[PDB]
Design a protein around this ligand. Sequence first.
Ligand SMILES: *[C@@H]1O[C@H](CO)[C@@H](O)[C@H](O)[C@H]1NC(C)=O
Length: 241
Amino acid sequence: RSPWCVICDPSVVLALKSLEKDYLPGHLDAKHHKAMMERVENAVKDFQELSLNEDAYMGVVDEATLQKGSWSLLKDLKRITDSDVKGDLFVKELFWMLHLQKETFATYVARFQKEAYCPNKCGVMLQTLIWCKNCKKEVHACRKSYDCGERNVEVPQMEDMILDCELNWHQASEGLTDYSFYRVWGNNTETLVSKGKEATLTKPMVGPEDAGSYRCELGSVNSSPATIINFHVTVLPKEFL
Ligand SMILES: *[C@@H]1O[C@H](CO)[C@@H](O)[C@H](O)[C@H]1NC(C)=O
């Protein structure tokens, strides 16, 4: 038993309060006002549309999903109020619209869950979620295996080395800082060779001295890195078979 997340949008609560104080007086008999608003409140206080799905309803959305559901509800409600509909027909249309809007919102949430909730496959992604139970907006840590799979990079001698540390979800993550690239030497020391906002390390015209191990770390405002990727560079001399 969980609220319909649209109530966490202030414009929705305002439009609902406006329905009650401004619309009801000229459009529904006074003796029904209390019972209507109770029925509206009950519709908004429970959202069951996703609670028998294979993927359990988690009670969270992102701001994008919230805004899309809210805008869809506000537009449909405004169509009712702009129409100036009254009485029995107004009641029928209002509750029909709320059912439809819950089903529309369910579609948006199932899609958020399937595609946009913690979409990383490794590393730690930070994403702001709104928790529908209390309308709290917080940064959630999407913690996955720190192993992103080692990259085997073979570069012909004299060609350009590109080491790419970017993952598909990095552009969407919160709290990121810099990509640092380290060369990891066989004598158990390391050298920081680049640090900045760029997700790649480029070395033009590679020679043997550029072969070996590299580690990329994408920093976070938190303690742990958002991503660690290891690269092994083999520099292929022309003489190889
Ligand atoms: C460790 O190896 C690196 C790369 O070969 C080199 O720059 C460094 O001087 C070595 N350190 C020692 C103490 O031998």
